[PDB]
Symmetry: C3
Subunit: 82 residues, 3 copies
């Protein structure tokens, strides 16, 4: 009877040691994870799609402007020609 | 009765250990759903909507100014003709 | 004395278990403060400040060129008059 109890205590102590090692590993893993407070949220961050769309609108206007300037320069050259 | 008491304590201990093992299994799954520090952007690397809006606005104002100058010039040229 | 020794081992085991339970409780709280993979924006979707700054600078250079062309044209028109 006593021997059987001793063997159960042995198994329990082994299980506990294993659990302690699991916990030690878990703590290390947690320390590698990012905190919610330190990570910029989707709400806060600009997406490539959004930026691309607004950049495209600007680019089209710049292209329009460049064409207008070229046309104007040609008109002026025509006006000033002898 | 001494042996019986020890057995009852062992029963409760084993139940507690089993519960802890199940908790640990659940924790490991939860950890796997969390983002690693190494896999995210470092503080202030990424562009915010506020910053982008401000930057775009400055460019937009300049473009609008330019378009106004062009319209005026086109009118001046039409008058010169 | 055999019984006494077992009883002492049980005392230590119960103390160890209580300590482990407290550790687990703390770990669960710590995990709840960590960011989820599902809630973090992907590399595919995000823009960096460096990338944006470079693109904005290229636009600024084009605007500077445009302004020089406009200024020149305004001067040409003033001369024509």
């Amino acid at each position: 009877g006593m021997k059987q109890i001793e063997m159960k205590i042995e198994e329990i102590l082994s299980k506990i040691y294993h659990i302690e090692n699991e916990i030690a590993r878990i703590k290390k893993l947690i320390n590698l994870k990012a905190n919610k407070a330190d990570v910029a949220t989707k709400d806060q961050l600009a997406t490539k799609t959004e930026i691309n769309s607004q950049m495209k609108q600007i680019e089209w206007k710049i292209e329009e402007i460049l064409s207008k300037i070229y046309h104007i320069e040609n008109e002026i050259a025509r006006i000033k020609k002898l």
